[PDB]
RNA sequence: ACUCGUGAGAGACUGCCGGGGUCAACUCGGAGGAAGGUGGGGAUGACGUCAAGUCAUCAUGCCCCUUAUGUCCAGGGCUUCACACAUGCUACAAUGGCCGGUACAAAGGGCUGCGAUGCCGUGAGGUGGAGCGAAUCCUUUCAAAGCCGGUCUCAGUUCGGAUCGGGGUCUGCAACUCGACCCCGUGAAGUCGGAGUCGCUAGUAAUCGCAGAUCAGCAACGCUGCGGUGAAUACGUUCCCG
C-alpha cells in the first residue's frame, strides 16, 4: 500500500496510487468533472509531464480545506512526493524545476486597531 | 455608581426587560461580559492580578 | 528601498504560449483579484486577432509592442520652488511596462461596449500602427526631444 | 401600442413594458401575465389586439392604476396632513416623516444645498 | 407593527372613567398622562388632554384620525425655525 | 457487559495528566480494562478588552481561556473498581464526570 | 495503513564552498534542504517628554448640599435642523444586470439555549417536537467570488437605490416622537468627482462571504477574528514630513 499527504495554505489532500490506466478519481469525479480549470489542469499535469510517465497511474484523492487553487496545489505536491517515493531516480528532476519546494505562505493575522493586516485607517492632519 | 442605583439594581425589576448588567465589583453598566459579570476594566485588572481560574494573556 | 534595490520578482512561464508577455498583460488587466476571467478575456482577444489577421499571435504582439515601446521619459526635479523637466532614457523593461499599461488603461475607452473586442481591436490597431498607443508614444518622444535642453543636471 | 391611454415603447419586454405604468412594477407584471397567459419572449412589435384586450380586462378587474392611484395616495396624504398627525406636520416642513435624521442626511427630502 | 392578537391597547384608568361618564349620560374632558394608548372608537365622542412633559394638550378626536396613538397627533418638542 | 466513559477536563496540563496517570494506575491495581486517555479538542474562548479607561480605543489587550478535555473508557466493569472509584482524590482544577 | 484531535522530540544554526573583503565583521552567488541567512506574524514599549487624558471604573485631601445638589416615581430628550467638518457603506454598470445548474474554506457559538422533519405561508413566520450541557445534535452534508447554459446592448438603463403610499411579521407590560425585518408601487440624486489629500513593498492591497463580543429585538454599514481568489512597480536621495 502507498498513501501520500499534501498541504497548501489550509488545504489538506490525501492521495492513493494504482499502476492502472490514465484516469483519476477526485472523490468520485474525474480530472475534468472536478477542478474544471485548464490552468489547474496543466498544474496537476506538471509532475507527470516532468517525469514523462503520464497515463501510467490512477490516483484516488480525498480532499479537505481550502479552495480550488489551494487544493490543486496540494494535490500537485502530494502526487509529486508520491512519485518521488515510488521512483527515487526522478528526485534530481523536480528539484530542478522546484516542485519539491513546499510553499510556506499563509494568511497573515488581521491586527486590531486597523482595517485588515497592514491596511490602516485614513489619517487627517486636523 | 450611586448607592441608590446599586440598590435598585440589586432590587429585582418588576418587568423582565427592566433588568441590566450592573457590573459586580464596581457597578459600571457598560461593557459587562456575561461570562464573568464584570466590567471590562475590572476584568482586565483582576486577570492581570492572577486571581481568575483560566484567564491568561493571548498571543498568536 | 532606501538602502538598495530589492531583488526582482520572477515571472512564471506562460503554459499555453511559452512567452511571458501574455501573462504580464493578463496580470496587469487583472483587477478585483480574478485570474480566470482576465485570462479568458485576453485569450478571447488573442483568438479574435488570430481569426482577423491570419498570423501567429506571438510575433504580431511582439512587433506591435516594439512599435509602441517608448524610448525616453521626462522627469521632474524641483529647485527653489520651481520645477525642471529633464529627459532620461528608459530601460527596455519599464518601456514595455509603460506601453502595456497605456494599452490596458486606454482599452476602456473604445465605444464598442465589450472589453474582449476592445482589446482585440486595439491590439490590431497597434499592430497596424494607427492605435492611440502610437499617439502617446509620439507625444512622449515629442516631449523628450523638445525639452532636451534641460539635462545639465545629469540624471 | 397603447396602455391605458399611454404610449407603449417600441422595443421593450412586456415584463418591462408593464413596469412603465404607475401601478405595475416587477412582481405585478409577472402575476398579471401568469393570470392572463401571455408568452414573455415576444416584443411590443408583435403585441396584437387579443393580448391588449385581455390585458386591460385583467388590469380593470385586479387593482387601481394611473390617475386613481395618484388621487388615492393624495387622499391618504390629505387625511394625514389636516388632522394634526405627526406625519402630516413632518410633511408640511419638508422633513422626513419616518423619524429619520436631518443633521447631515435627508438631502433628497429638503432638496439641493443652500449654503449659509 | 403592533401585534393585533393582543388587541388594541388601553390602560384601565381612562377606560373606567369613560365607562362611569357614558353610563351616567355624561361627556366631559379626559386628562391623561399616557401617550402609548391607542384611539378607541368609543372615545371618538370625547376629548383627551394628553401630557407632553410640562402640561396637557387637549385633542378632540374624530373619525379621521382613528387607528393611531395619541402622540401621533400631539407633538412634544418645540422648534421655531432659525 | 457494560462499558463506561469518563470525561476528564482541566485548564492545567500538569494536573490533568497527573489525574489520568493516577486513575490508570488505580484501575491497573484493581484489575479492570481501560482503553486509555484519548485526547480531545481543546476549547478556546477569546476576548478583547480596552487597556485604557476613558478613550484611546486603538490600544487593547486580548484574553484567552483554554480547556483541555479527554475521555477514559473502561471495559469489564469490575465491581471493586466501582467501589474504589469515587474515593480517588483528584486535583482542584480537574473535573471528571461519568457517561 | 492516511489526515485529524494532543503530548514529547528533531530541524536553520553563515552549517559548507567561491568571489569581494584589512584573512575582519560583513555582502552576494552556489550546494543540500520545507524553508538561507532574525523562514512569517504576535507578545514584550528603558531612562525621558507633553502640568497630555481619565475626580463619570474605583479610591483619594480640601471645599459644597445635608431637610437638600439627597432621594422613588410617570411622560419627554440625548434621533430636534437653513448649515460645516470627519469616518464609513452603497452607486454612476457590460471586467456588468437579471434567470437555472454546478463544487471546494476556516473559525466560532449554543439551557428556560442552538433548535432539524412534517403541517400552512411570496417571507419574516404560527403548531409542536426528535439531538445535545455538548469532536455526538444545530449553524443546511456548512457561504460568495468561481464555471457552464439563456437573455439584456448602452438609455437615468432589466443601473442605481433614496423619499413617499397601502398592508404585515417577530420581540417587548408597553413599537407615534424612536426597534428590526416582509409584500406591492412611482422611482430622486448620481455620468468617474476642482484646489487638495489618504492606505499600501507578499499571500499585501483589492474584492467576497462567514463567525464572535455587547443583545429579548436591533440603528451593526461599527469593532475583533477567519478563510477564498489574488498582480504592479521600488531607477535612486534631489525635494515634503517625523
UniProtKB/Swiss-Prot annotation, chain B:
This is Small ribosomal subunit protein uS14B. PANTHER family: 30S RIBOSOMAL PROTEIN S14, SMALL RIBOSOMAL SUBUNIT PROTEIN US14M. Belongs to the universal ribosomal protein uS14 family. Zinc-binding uS14 subfamily. One of its GO terms (biological process) is translation. GO terms for cellular component: cytoplasm; small ribosomal subunit. HAMAP family: Ribosomal_uS14_2_B. SUPFAM superfamilies: Glucocorticoid receptor-like (DNA-binding domain) (SSF57716). Binds 16S rRNA, required for the assembly of 30S particles and may also be responsible for determining the conformation of the 16S rRNA at the A site. Keywords: Metal-binding, Ribonucleoprotein, Ribosomal protein, RNA-binding, rRNA-binding, Zinc. Pfam families: Ribosomal_S14 (PF00253). Part of the 30S ribosomal subunit. Contacts proteins S3 and S10. Its cofactor is Zn(2+). It comes from the Bacteria. Transmembrane segments: none annotated. Zn(2+) binds at residues 23, 26, 39, 42. Binds 1 zinc ion per subunit. One of its GO terms (molecular function) is rRNA binding.
UniProtKB/Swiss-Prot annotation, chain C:
It comes from the Bacteria. Keywords: Ribonucleoprotein, Ribosomal protein, RNA-binding, rRNA-binding, tRNA-binding. One of its GO terms (molecular function) is structural constituent of ribosome. CDD domains: uS7_Bacteria. GO terms for biological process: translation. GO terms for cellular component: small ribosomal subunit. Gene3D superfamilies: Ribosomal protein S7 domain. InterPro entries: Ribosomal_uS7 (IPR000235), Ribosomal_uS7_bac/org-type (IPR005717), Ribosomal_uS7_CS (IPR020606), Ribosomal_uS7_dom (IPR023798), Ribosomal_uS7_dom_sf (IPR036823). One of the primary rRNA binding proteins, it binds directly to 16S rRNA where it nucleates assembly of the head domain of the 30S subunit. Is located at the subunit interface close to the decoding center, probably blocks exit of the E-site tRNA. Belongs to the universal ribosomal protein uS7 family. HAMAP family: Ribosomal_uS7_B. Part of the 30S ribosomal subunit. Contacts proteins S9 and S11. This is Small ribosomal subunit protein uS7. It comes from Mycolicibacterium smegmatis (strain ATCC 700084 / mc(2)155).
Curated annotation (Swiss-Prot), chain E:
GO terms for cellular component: cytoplasm; small ribosomal subunit. Keywords: Ribonucleoprotein, Ribosomal protein, RNA-binding, rRNA-binding. One of its GO terms (biological process) is translation. Pfam families: Ribosomal_S19. PROSITE patterns: RIBOSOMAL_S19. GO terms for molecular function: rRNA binding; structural constituent of ribosome. Belongs to the universal ribosomal protein uS19 family. Protein S19 forms a complex with S13 that binds strongly to the 16S ribosomal RNA. This is Small ribosomal subunit protein uS19. It comes from Mycolicibacterium smegmatis (strain ATCC 700084 / mc(2)155) (Mycobacterium smegmatis).
Swiss-Prot record, chain F:
The keyword Ribosomal protein applies. It comes from the Bacteria. GO terms for cellular component: ribonucleoprotein complex; ribosome. Keywords: Ribonucleoprotein, Ribosomal protein. GO terms for biological process: translation. GO terms for molecular function: structural constituent of ribosome; tRNA binding. Part of the 30S ribosomal subunit. Involved in the binding of tRNA to the ribosomes. Belongs to the universal ribosomal protein uS10 family. This is Small ribosomal subunit protein uS10.
Amino acid at each position: 500500500p502507498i498513501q501520500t499527504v499534501g498541504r497548501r495554505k489550509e488545504a489538506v489532500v490525501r492521495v492513493r496510487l494504482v499502476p492502472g490506466t490514465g484516469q483519476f478519481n477526485l472523490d468520485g469525479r474525474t480530472l475534468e468533472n472536478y477542478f474544471p480549470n485548464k490552468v489547474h489542469q496543466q498544474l496537476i499535469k506538471a509532475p507527470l509531464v516532468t517525469v514523462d510517465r503520464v497515463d501510467q497511474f490512477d490516483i484516488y484523492a480525498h480532499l479537505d480545506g481550502g479552495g480550488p487553487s489551494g487544493q490543486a496545489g496540494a494535490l500537485r505536491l502530494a502526487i509529486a512526493r508520491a512519485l518521488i517515493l515510488v521512483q527515487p531516480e526522478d528526485r534530481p528532476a523536480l528539484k530542478k524545476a522546484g516542485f519539491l519546494t513546499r510553499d510556506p505562505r499563509a494568511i497573515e493575522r488581521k491586527k486590531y486597531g486597523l482595517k485588515k493586516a497592514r491596511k490602516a485607517p485614513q489619517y487627517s492632519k486636523r | 455608581a450611586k448607592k441608590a442605583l446599586v440598590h435598585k439594581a440589586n432590587k429585582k425589576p418588576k418587568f423582565a426587560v427592566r433588568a441590566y448588567t450592573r457590573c459586580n465589583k464596581c457597578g459600571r453598566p457598560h461593557s459587562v461580559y456575561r461570562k464573568f459579570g464584570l466590567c471590562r476594566i475590572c476584568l482586565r485588572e483582576m486577570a492581570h492580578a492572577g486571581e481568575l481560574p483560566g484567564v491568561q494573556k493571548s498571543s498568536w | 528601498p532606501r538602502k538598495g534595490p530589492a531583488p526582482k520578482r520572477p515571472l512564471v512561464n506562460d503554459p499555453v504560449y511559452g512567452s511571458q508577455l501574455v501573462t504580464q498583460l493578463v496580470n496587469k488587466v487583472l483587477l478585483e483579484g480574478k485570474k480566470s476571467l482576465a485570462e479568458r478575456i485576453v485569450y478571447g482577444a488573442l483568438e479574435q486577432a488570430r481569426e482577423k489577421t491570419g498570423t501567429d499571435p506571438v510575433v504580431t504582439l511582439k512587433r506591435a509592442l516594439d512599435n509602441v515601446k517608448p524610448a525616453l521619459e521626462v522627469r521632474s526635479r524641483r529647485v527653489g520652488g520651481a520645477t525642471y523637466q529633464v529627459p532620461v532614457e528608459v530601460r527596455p523593461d519599464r518601456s514595455t511596462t509603460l506601453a502595456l499599461r497605456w494599452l490596458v488603461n486606454f482599452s476602456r475607452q473604445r465605444r464598442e461596449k465589450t472589453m474582449v473586442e476592445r482589446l482585440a481591436n486595439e491590439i490590431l490597431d497597434a499592430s497596424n500602427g494607427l492605435g492611440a498607443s502610437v499617439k502617446r508614444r509620439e507625444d512622449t518622444h515629442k516631449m523628450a526631444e523638445a525639452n532636451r535642453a534641460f539635462a545639465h543636471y545629469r540624471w | 401600442a397603447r396602455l391605458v391611454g399611454v404610449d407603449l415603447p417600441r422595443d421593450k419586454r412586456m415584463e418591462i413594458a408593464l413596469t412603465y405604468i404607475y401601478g405595475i412594477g416587477r412582481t405585478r407584471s409577472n402575476e398579471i401575465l401568469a393570470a392572463t397567459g401571455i408568452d414573455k419572449n415576444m416584443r411590443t412589435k408583435d403585441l396584437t389586439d387579443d393580448q391588449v384586450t385581455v390585458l386591460r380586462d385583467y388590469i380593470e378587474g385586479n387593482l387601481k392604476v394611473e390617475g386613481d392611484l395618484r388621487r388615492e395616495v393624495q387622499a391618504d396624504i390629505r387625511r394625514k396632513i389636516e388632522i394634526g398627525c405627526y406625519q402630516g406636520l413632518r410633511h408640511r416642513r419638508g422633513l422626513p416623516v419616518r423619524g429619520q435624521r436631518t443633521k447631515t442626511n435627508a438631502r433628497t427630502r429638503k432638496g439641493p444645498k443652500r449654503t449659509i | 407593527p403592533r401585534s393585533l392578537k393582543k388587541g388594541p391597547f388601553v390602560d384601565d384608568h381612562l377606560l373606567k372613567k369613560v365607562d362611569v361618564q357614558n353610563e351616567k349620560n355624561t361627556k366631559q374632558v379626559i386628562k391623561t398622562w399616557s401617550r402609548r394608548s391607542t384611539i378607541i372608537p368609543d372615545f371618538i365622542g370625547h376629548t383627551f388632554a394628553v401630557h407632553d412633559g410640562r402640561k396637557h394638550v387637549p385633542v378632540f378626536v374624530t373619525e379621521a384620525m382613528v387607528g393611531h396613538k395619541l402622540g401621533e397627533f400631539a407633538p412634544t418638542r418645540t422648534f421655531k425655525g432659525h | 457487559g457494560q462499558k463506561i466513559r469518563i470525561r476528564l477536563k482541566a485548564y492545567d496540563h500538569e494536573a490533568i495528566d497527573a489525574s489520568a496517570r493516577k486513575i490508570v494506575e488505580t484501575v491497573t491495581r484493581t484489575g479492570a480494562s481501560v482503553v486509555g486517555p484519548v485526547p480531545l479538542p481543546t476549547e478556546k474562548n477569546v476576548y478583547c478588552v480596552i487597556r485604557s479607561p476613558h478613550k484611546y480605543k486603538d490600544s487593547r489587550e486580548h484574553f484567552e481561556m483554554r480547556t483541555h478535555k479527554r475521555l477514559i473508557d473502561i471495559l469489564d466493569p469490575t465491581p471493586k473498581t466501582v467501589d474504589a472509584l469515587m474515593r480517588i482524590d483528584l486535583p482542584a482544577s480537574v473535573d471528571v464526570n461519568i457517561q
